[PDB]
Amino acid sequence: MELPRAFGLLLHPTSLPGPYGVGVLGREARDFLRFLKEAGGRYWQVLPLGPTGYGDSPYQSFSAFAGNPYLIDLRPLAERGYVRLEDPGFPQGRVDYGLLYAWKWPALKEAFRGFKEKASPEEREAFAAFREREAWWLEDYALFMALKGAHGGLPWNRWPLPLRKREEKALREAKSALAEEVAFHAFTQWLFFRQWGALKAEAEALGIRIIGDMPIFVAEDSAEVWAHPEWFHLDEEGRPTVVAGVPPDYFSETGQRWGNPLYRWDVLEREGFSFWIRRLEKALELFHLVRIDHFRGFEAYWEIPASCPTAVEGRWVKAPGEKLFQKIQEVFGEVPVLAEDLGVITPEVEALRDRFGLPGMKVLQFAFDDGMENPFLPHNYPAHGRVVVYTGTHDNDTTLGWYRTATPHEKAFMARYLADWGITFREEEEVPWALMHLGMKSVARLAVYPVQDVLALGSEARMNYPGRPSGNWAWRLLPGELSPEHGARLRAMAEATERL
Ligand SMILES: C[C@H]1O[C@H](O[C@H]2[C@H](O)[C@@H](O)[C@@H](O[C@H]3[C@H](O)[C@@H](O)[C@@H](O)O[C@@H]3CO)O[C@@H]2CO)[C@H](O)[C@@H](O)[C@@H]1N[C@H]1C=C(CO)[C@@H](O)[C@H](O)[C@H]1O
Numbered sequence: 001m002e003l004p005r006a007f008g009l010l011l012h013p014t015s016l017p018g019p020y021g022v023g024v025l026g027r028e029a030r031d032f033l034r035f036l037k038e039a040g041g042r043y044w045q046v047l048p049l050g051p052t053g054y055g056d057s058p059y060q061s062f063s064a065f066a067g068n069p070y071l072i073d074l075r076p077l078a079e080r081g082y083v084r085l086e087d088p089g090f091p092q093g094r095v096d097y098g099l100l101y102a103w104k105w106p107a108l109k110e111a112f113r114g115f116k117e118k119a120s121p122e123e124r125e126a127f128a129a130f131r132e133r134e135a136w137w138l139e140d141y142a143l144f145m146a147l148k149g150a151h152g153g154l155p156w157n158r159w160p161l162p163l164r165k166r167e168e169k170a171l172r173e174a175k176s177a178l179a180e181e182v183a184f185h186a187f188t189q190w191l192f193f194r195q196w197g198a199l200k201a202e203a204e205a206l207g208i209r210i211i212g213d214m215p216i217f218v219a220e221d222s223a224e225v226w227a228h229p230e231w232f233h234l235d236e237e238g239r240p241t242v243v244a245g246v247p248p249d250y251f252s253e254t255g256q257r258w259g260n261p262l263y264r265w266d267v268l269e270r271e272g273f274s275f276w277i278r279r280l281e282k283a284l285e286l287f288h289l290v291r292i293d294h295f296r297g298f299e300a301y302w303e304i305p306a307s308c309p310t311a312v313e314g315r316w317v318k319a320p321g322e323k324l325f326q327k328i329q330e331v332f333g334e335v336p337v338l339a340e341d342l343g344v345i346t347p348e349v350e351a352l353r354d355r356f357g358l359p360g361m362k363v364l365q366f367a368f369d370d371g372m373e374n375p376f377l378p379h380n381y382p383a384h385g386r387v388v389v390y391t392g393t394h395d396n397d398t399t400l401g402w403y404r405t406a407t408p409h410e411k412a413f414m415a416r417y418l419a420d421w422g423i424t425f426r427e428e429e430e431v432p433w434a435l436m437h438l439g440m441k442s443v444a445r446l447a448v449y450p451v452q453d454v455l456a457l458g459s460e461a462r463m464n465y466p467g468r469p470s471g472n473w474a475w476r477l478l479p480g481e482l483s484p485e486h487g488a489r490l491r492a493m494a495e496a497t498e499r500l
């Protein structure tokens, strides 16, 4: 993949400013694209866009295909009279997910009722047409969500056996009994894709490419796992027999047990990797590039017996990454994938990435805790530049927040390294900019930065803190917070580093 030298910004849509408690796919999203274009940015990166559950993590979605109903802009609906919106008291600068769950679901439900009553024939037709075209994943997703709502939010593998095991007769009866609930969820999808499609066209009109994000492993409690038990290592009761994670290492003697169901790779290969082809086809309708989290899992993954409460009991298992990507190349004619390969250092993963021209990542906040051999330091990046450099990702603190808690060593080495690259700073608040500048001076073809670093926000704006119980995925921009001055500063930096 040939990436021209450029820069972009990382901003999950929920973080957009605007009324009604959460960023949505509307004017403010368009304002951000405009800001990005004026700043000279050519990429907008988001986190996974699927529907979320308790904890609100984009990385644990009810579906590998559905769009997050919380991102639906309700204004176009209120404007056609389908619903009357009333702010129950959403805060500024953050998403109160508890309130959004309590208020937005009913507002979408009311909107659907108003729609059935007032929609024009053209809208009814379009929605029906959408349900037909997307049936191959929508039938399962909409029934999955209807069943979930009818069984008190229980995970699919705790539902009555006939439904859990998808006995046809039982599914047909449920689909019939929950007809309006199924149509309602299908309605949230039609709105989500219509709005995303419009936003994507806006991005394209502005010369902007969108980098989507798809975790390599799906979630246990999701429509596709329920509908395709044959593609995952589950027992007869739908329980994963092995789960994803990573082994212990110098950092943790317990490793990480993520819990995700794992693929029956032999079955997927036999089916021409249909699940993955479908997954990518759907994603390519929404994005120009797809970042895949834990890309190394296509080469080998840490398989943990589900009975083990930690990650200590696993073993590395080879996956057919080569054949899968050969299949992806064959079908799509290119592999529009960005590999999340943080801390892999394994040769075979690098080789698989390179074989298909896939860029990896570099995160500057991790470059100063040791020596000059640290792979995250710019002089160590590959001369071919097929890598995306970030100051920090959604899992890291903002760079100012990181700086304030960095070790004396990190702070001193960073400053010295910056100076070696002709960069300096005076106040703490300037560190995010100095690091963004260091990334832009690097050979990395793409430099992508979280908006919180553009705003030089502290720890209060950190998107996600892995391991922390609450406050995650909630940060939001305030109206007008990204000023023309922020854009001009990014633009001047891009111009100087030849990224325009
Ligand atoms: C306040 C709370 O709002 C959100 O909570 C809702 C979840 O998104 C829903 O999916 C639903 O969760 C139920 C599960 O579906 C069901 O399978 C079962 O496990 O019971 C769950 C509880 O009913 O309903 C949730 C609301 O009740 C949001 O996702 C969640 O993160 C929010 N919780 C935050 C607030 C506090 C209060 O200090 C903390 O305990 C949490 O760590 C925060 O994340």
Ligand SMILES: C[C@H]1O[C@H](O[C@H]2[C@H](O)[C@@H](O)[C@@H](O[C@H]3[C@H](O)[C@@H](O)[C@@H](O)O[C@@H]3CO)O[C@@H]2CO)[C@H](O)[C@@H](O)[C@@H]1N[C@H]1C=C(CO)[C@@H](O)[C@H](O)[C@H]1O
Residues within 6 Å of the ligand: 055, 057, 058, 059, 060, 215, 246, 256, 257, 258, 259, 293, 294, 295, 340, 342, 395, 464, 465, 466, 467, 468
């Ligand atoms: C659901 C999960 O969401 C968050 O975790 C994800 C990260 O945000 C992603 O960036 C991605 O990171 C991993 C890299 O892809 C991988 O290559 C390696 O570097 O490890 C990274 C994470 O250590 O994927 C993460 C999901 O694996 C969030 O931080 C995390 O806390 C959330 N976990 C919830 C799920 C379970 C399972 O029941 C519980 O154990 C946790 O307490 C929940 O918070």
